[PDB]
């Protein structure tokens with residue numbers, strides 16, 4: 001009934017069915033995202049929809065390689081969190097998802113990154129509305145993925161959003177109570 | 186429908202005098218708090234500024250910085266601000282009943298990306314609740330941070346004046362999304 005319910009229900013999806021959602025469902029989510037505010041109304045988001053299996057595999061293996069090295073080297077709170085949740089460098093969802101939605105920011109636009117991540121928040125809620133799942137996937141290095149898809153120098157790959165029908169995704173992680181202070185710290 | 190909420194939402198830089206109930210802001214923060222974040226760090230922190238003197242200080246600090254910004258701005262930037270009739274004046278920093286300051290946890294991985302994602306949620310929630318907002322980014326964050334005794338571990342991301350809308354200014358255009366497939 002409420003946006004809160006939609007936001008509450010929405011959780012990471014890293015398990016996907018093979019079945020291809022209608023393009024319109026994914027395009028819907030871009031149309032919602034595109035209504036978002038942005039610095040100087042530049043609308044600095046650009047979308048690349050990757051579906052080609054060979055290309056998905058190339059992207060998967062580049063990310064996995066990058067991740068494997070990262071997993072050898074990560075420390076601190078991130079390592080502790082990844083270890084406890086038994087994450088590894090393997091990223092099968094980059095092949096299994098029917099879409100990889102690559103989201104780029106226009107580097108030259110003011111507050112381009114802030115604006116695109118804001119729009120991604122819109123986008124994720126829209127996907128949830130359509131019964132699609134995703135995960136903001138951010139490999140350690142984006143340069144090689146950018147090269148794989150011939151990214152122009154003007155654009156920065158922000159995130160890989162695998163999108164598909166969820167396949168019994170694991171439960172939402174907890175949320176701490178929101179932390180609100182008044183007037184000053 | 187979510188598209189309707191997103192499509193209708195526009196910037197609000199002019200607010201009614203009446204103060205909305207705090208519940209509606211808190212609702213919006215609870216929505217934001219449901220957003221994903223890198224390693225589920227939930228790296229957002231919120232400061233609600235209501236005190237009139239403090240809002241005034243924030244307003245004055247930002248305006249002084251904007252004055253300098255506007256003295257010097259040129260090119261594309263200048264043309265857009267001119268055509269939209271922006272000036273260094275930011276009266277809504279004083280006149281909005283609430284300034285919602287959004288901070289990111291500097292040390293949290295993916296903190297900036299996560300907080301701005303959550304700001305997306307937040308803005309939709311404010312719209313749902315019938316409130317207006319503008320993501321105001323001051324030219325000098327540090328001066329504002331000091332005004333509210335920001336701890337060194339936090340980074341101010343954005344000032345969101347929040348109130349009942351009183352802004353007739355129409356939403357600016359949105360170009361149709363043009364997608365690409367597989368490669369550029």
Ligand SMILES: Cc1cc2nc3c(=O)[nH]c(=O)nc-3n(C[C@H](O)[C@H](O)[C@H](O)COP(=O)(O)O)c2cc1C
Pocket residue numbers: 036037038039040041111114115118194195196319320321322323355356357358
């Ligand atoms: C990251 C970001 C920073 C912004 N900074 C400012 C700002 O400093 N001053 C301002 O008046 N509006 C600011 N805005 C609001 C934009 O100008 C506004 O979102 C854009 O004009 C589109 O407005 P509309 O949704 O009503 O079409 C900012 C928006 C974003 C997303």
Ligand SMILES: Cc1cc2nc3c(=O)[nH]c(=O)nc-3n(C[C@H](O)[C@H](O)[C@H](O)COP(=O)(O)O)c2cc1C
Pocket residue numbers: 010011012014135136137138139171172173174219220221222223224225295298299302
């Ligand atoms: C900026 C950002 C980057 C993320 N990067 C990754 C990632 O690289 N790999 C991954 O599996 N999940 C990634 N996530 C998903 C988070 O792990 C997830 O949002 C968090 O665990 C909360 O999940 P939940 O909403 O299901 O509770 C990312 C999320 C955000 C916001």
Ligand SMILES: N[C@@H](Cc1ccc(O)cc1)C(=O)O
Pocket residue numbers: 038039040041110251271272273322323324
């Ligand atoms: N921060 C400046 C410039 C600005 C305005 C609107 C924007 O979307 C971005 C930047 C102002 O408020 O006037």
Ligand SMILES: N[C@@H](Cc1ccc(O)cc1)C(=O)O
Pocket residue numbers: 067082087088089138139140222223224225
């Ligand atoms: N990118 C790495 C590490 C990571 C995992 C989850 C996150 O939320 C953030 C980072 C992975 O996908 O395994």
Ligand SMILES: [Cl-]
Pocket residue numbers: 011012013134135136221222
């Ligand atoms: Cl997620």
Ligand SMILES: [Cl-]
Pocket residue numbers: 040041357358
């Ligand atoms: Cl415009």
Ligand SMILES: [Cl-]
Pocket residue numbers: 107113156
């Ligand atoms: Cl950049």
Ligand SMILES: [Cl-]
Pocket residue numbers: 012013014015168169170
């Ligand atoms: Cl899952």
Ligand SMILES: [Cl-]
Pocket residue numbers: 037038195196197318319320
């Ligand atoms: Cl806005």
Ligand SMILES: [Cl-]
Pocket residue numbers: 173174224225
């Ligand atoms: Cl957790």
